[model samples]
Target: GSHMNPPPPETSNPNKPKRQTNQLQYLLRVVLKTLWKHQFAWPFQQPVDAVKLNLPDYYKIIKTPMDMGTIKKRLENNYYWNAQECIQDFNTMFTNCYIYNKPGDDIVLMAEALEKLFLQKINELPTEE
Candidate 1:
């Protein structure tokens, strides 16, 4: 007589939770690179305004594009650093903006929190002031 076996391990369902598209994934890479290139500008006499760069960088990154597939995959992945986290950070930054509030949300506070939580993991943020 044989004993009953346990249920099969839960495998990832690609169809259920899609992954980031090649396009969006590539664009995210560009955003991170651009951020790095411009980081030196700040705290220095000459600051490179990323927005003013001649390259078609910022224009390519269409924030929060309608890609339900990628969104689901990202949520399921539970990655320490991923497009979803970046987009969420950006969203928080925007939400903290004073555009729709009387007193206005403290964008600075939100930014600091974002930097601590996300940036710390990636080590992209500055260690000093």
Candidate 2:
């Protein structure tokens, strides 16, 4: 029994010229590189100085594919804690504390709240001239 070197590893056809496989991906890479390279030209161009906290970088952090967990967690712990405190004494009427042990429910609520809160924040941002 014998195998003939797996048919020369099925090499690519040399006659076919190499190409940028995906135009959109290529364009995105170049655009991102250019943006990073020339970032110094903008007003207040340099990175912001901060003490363990920083504002979001708009050019690098596009809102289209943004994730909202960071903002949501902050709101949940801050605002939610205050809201729950107001009704803490009367909270025994509804006991769904067991739900907290579950994994997916917490994330579901977080995502829902995140979407709503993020939309509100985004709307508040002034439009660029």
Candidate 3:
């Protein structure tokens, strides 16, 4: 009749230090944040407002609209398995800008610079482990 004098109430404590649990995730976070924080990040930081600026045939031109914002969320949601996947989206974003805008355009130039930084950061990352 006396199993336990007091009963423990339910406690939900699921929070953990998630920022650096995965090395690759941390790396991607740093790279993506760096891009978003870049001075030239203005153009590619988020998805372009095709309708606002009256860009014709935007979706028709760029099949997959990729941006640093989307990539950041995708990485946070564990959508990418390898770093290469993120790289693919970055490339697509730049490619879309290049195809849509005229050569030597401002947006295109920003994309060029940002992608160059992206590649350089990726290169600095250790491929081992």
Candidate number of the best lDDT: 3
TM-score, candidate number 3: 0.76
Model 2 CA deviation exceeding 4 Å by range: 1-104
lDDT agreement with native, every candidate: 0.35, 0.27, 0.69
**What is the C-alpha lDDT profile of model 2 across 1-129, one tens digit per residue?**
113111211123445333322322322243222322332322111222222223234323322221112212222233222322212311221122222224456534443443344335334433322
The model with the greater TM-score, 1 or 3, is 3
lDDT of 1: 0.35
Superposition TM-score, candidate 1 onto the true structure: 0.25
Model 3 per-residue lDDT tens digits across residues 1-129:
122212211112235222233445755667887888889997776677666667657766777777777777666666655666667887888898999999898888888888888888878776546
Q: Estimate each model's TM-score.
A: 0.25, 0.21, 0.76
Worst 10 residues of 2 by lDDT: 1-10
**lDDT per residue as tens, model 1, 1-129:** 112222222224545544444333533454333432343313111111234444234223422222212323333453223355545644443342323233424534443443344354444432321
The Cα RMSD in angstroms, rounded to one decimal, for candidate 2 relative to the true structure is: 23.0
Q: What RMSD does model 1 have?
A: 18.7
